[PDB]
């Protein structure tokens, strides 16, 4: 397949070829043009707060060690020994001043440097140039209010610029709330879906909620429960959708601070969020204080998703075209009482974790949609994302980005796939920029 020429996503992001969820050659191509090029979620400050603390993370199919340095910074390195390529670290988290390889005993520092080689003097003499044998380092590591992302491509935009118009929506909860913590360890489960299936679902799919999650809505009695079985459509002005230049987007459901949490947490959460909102009105204005306590379903392009307020935080780690390893953390507000943090974390896992009853509702939808992308008669078929097309705006006086002023639509699919297609057909960041110079115009056509 010629990725320069092949139209995998049609103009304005209106449709995508079904093969994108199934084609292994394209998956391999995505490793280069999506995962090696873009910002990928690694960890949070709260999980590696002290010098020497480390975790392992996936970046695409690669594994990295992410380590807190003595100077308070974070550096990340391929989890691969520079001698004969053995995996250096076999655990998920810990604290160490370095990592010793179990094959021939080479010792690397937390700073990636090759610090020791067994019997170096007797074996290598002065001939081993250890300065050139440091672990292969992730070129870019940056923080968004404690959330640490990495990028293999030195040419990438800064993380803040990469978030584009999405940052404005995230800031009330990520910054102005006083800050979030990530509660680990994550749940980890393999699903037989393409990574794009859950990514597209979290970035922009409010339409599926009442039908897919009918049973979970009816059974849990959460605040979005009026939607069960499509019994009721959200009122006008219930929410909006947005998307951005580099592909990140989200839905906003106004005031939905208790999110998917069952009735057992609803009064406590609605009280807590409302109280902080009242304080935030004076600081960031009424609209942004309201966004803080509104439910955001967001994907940070390409494969990091979240539900703010519900507190669900996801990494869709790619394995092959029909295999994804799902990591699920809980996000909590730092100034919540500890007992509330604990119950919120359990509730995140109860609903969206490995035995998350909501997340289970999505399995067959994601898996079969992905697997059908391999089927002969479906490869060249068109997946539709035209809902709301012709009603999106850009440059609004109140809400930034490409915005659909309605709670349910496919605005954020279009922006996600527009960015996806621009990357797949480009050889570097400069070419992506050239391919994106009229990004919002393309999305707001008709």
């Amino acid at each position: 397949m010629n990725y320069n020429n092949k139209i995998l996503v049609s103009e304005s992001g209106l449709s995508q070829k079904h093969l994108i969820h199934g084609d292994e050659e394209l998956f391999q191509h995505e490793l280069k043009t999506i995962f090696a090029r873009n910002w990928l979620f690694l960890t949070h400050d709260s999980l590696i707060p002290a010098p020497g603390d480390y975790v392992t993370a996936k970046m695409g199919i690669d594994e990295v060690i992410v380590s807190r340095q003595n100077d308070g910074s974070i550096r990340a390195f391929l989890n691969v020994c520079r001698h004969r390529g053995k995996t250096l670290v076999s655990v998920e988290a810990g604290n160490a001043k370095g990592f010793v390889c179990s094959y021939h005993g080479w010792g690397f520092g937390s700073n990636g440097e090759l610090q020791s080689v067994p019997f170096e003097k007797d074996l290598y003499g002065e001939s081993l140039n250890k300065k050139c044998l440091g672990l292969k380092e992730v070129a870019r590591v940056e923080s968004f209010h404690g959330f640490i992302y990495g990028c293999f491509d030195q040419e990438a935009p800064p993380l803040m610029d990469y978030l584009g118009d999405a940052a404005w929506y995230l800031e009330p909860m990520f910054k102005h709330s006083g800050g979030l913590e990530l509660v680990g360890p994550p749940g980890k489960v393999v699903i037989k879906a393409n990574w794009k299936a859950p990514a597209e679902n979290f970035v922009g799919d409010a339409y599926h909620v009442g039908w897919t999650h009918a049973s979970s809505l009816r059974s849990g009695e959460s605040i979005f429960s009026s939607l069960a079985g499509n019994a009721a459509l959200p009122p006008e002005g219930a929410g909006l959708q947005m998307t951005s230049k580099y592909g990140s987007g989200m839905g906003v459901l106004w005031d939905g601070y208790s999110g998917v949490h069952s009735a057992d947490l609803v009064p406590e959460l609605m009280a807590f969020g409302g109280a902080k909102q009242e304080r935030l009105n004076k600081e960031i204005g009424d609209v942004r204080a309201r966004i803080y306590r509104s439910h955001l379903n967001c994907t940070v392009f390409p494969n990091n998703s979240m539900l703010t307020c519900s507190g669900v935080f996801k990494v869709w780690n790619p394995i092959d075209a029909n295999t994804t390893e799902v990591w699920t953390y809980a996000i909590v507000e730092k100034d919540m009482p500890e007992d509330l943090k604990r119950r919120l974390a359990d509730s995140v896992q109860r609903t969206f974790g490995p035995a998350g009853f909501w997340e289970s509702d999505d399995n067959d939808n994601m898996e079969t949609a992905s697997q059908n992308g391999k089927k002969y008669q479906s490869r060249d078929s068109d997946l539709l994302s035209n809902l709301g097309f012709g009603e999106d705006v850009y440059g609004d006086a109140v809400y930034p980005g490409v915005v659909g002023k309605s709670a349910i639509g496919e605005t954020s699919y279009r922006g996600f796939y527009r960015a996806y297609q621009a990357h797949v057909s480009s050889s570097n960041w400069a070419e992506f920029e050239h391919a994106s110079s009229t990004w919002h115009t393309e999305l707001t056509k008709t």
């Binding site: 998920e92 988290a93 604290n95 509660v183 980890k188 699903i191 059974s219 035995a355 289970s360």
Partner: protein, 192 residues
């Protein structure tokens, strides 16, 4: 067990060994076997309401954890060691049961098939609460659905059971430390 000598053994595991190595009551082991076999039968036929009514105590904690992989020699890193795949009270179990029984649970059509294999049953009365029964058992759980999906789960269960309404012994605590860190079964949406 001396865990200073038996270097691989956790303090928790050593405590549980001690519990069953002393007063062996053969009749109790057999009562426990019946109790667990009947529970598994109810679950296998998806009689989830009957399971709650007959097997699950009002004060239950039903907990399945997933422990983060850490170095055997780790002594400094102190953050949350595990997450809760399940950590349910009775009402939370009831929510999960209603979710299973809801006619709009699309994933349950066509009907799933469950087969459970319960082995290695051990039973001992609590020393301090003579009405509390400790039961340990291992489960293989086979779930089949949709022609060619097959998921097999493996676990050890640390249970406490107590006589409740009508004198019927019911589960007041189940604890499972799930042995596989990354699930390869699509989800853990089964009652271990």
């Amino acid at each position: 067990i001396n865990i200073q000598e038996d270097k691989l053994v956790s303090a928790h595991d050593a405590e549980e060994i001690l519990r069953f190595f002393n007063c062996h009551d053969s009749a109790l082991q057999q009562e426990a076997t019946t109790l667990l076999t009947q529970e598994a039968h109810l679950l296998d036929i998806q009689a989830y309401r009957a399971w709650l009514e007959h097997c699950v105590g009002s004060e239950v904690q039903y907990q399945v954890i997933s422990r983060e992989l850490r170095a055997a020699s780790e002594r400094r890193y102190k953050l949350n060691e595990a997450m809760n795949v399940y950590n349910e009270n009775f009402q939370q179990l009831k929510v999960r049961v209603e979710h299973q029984l809801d006619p709009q649970n699309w994933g349950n059509s066509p009907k799933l098939r469950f087969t459970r294999f319960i082995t290695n049953v051990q039973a001992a009365m609590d020393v301090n609460d003579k009405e509390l029964l400790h039961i340990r058992s291992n489960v293989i759980l086979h779930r089949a659905r949709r022609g060619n999906q097959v998921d097999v789960f493996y676990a050890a269960r640390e249970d406490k059971w107590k006589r409740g309404e009508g004198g019927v012994r019911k589960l007041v605590q189940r604890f499972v430390d799930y042995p596989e860190r990354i699930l390869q079964t699509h989800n853990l949406m089964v009652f271990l």
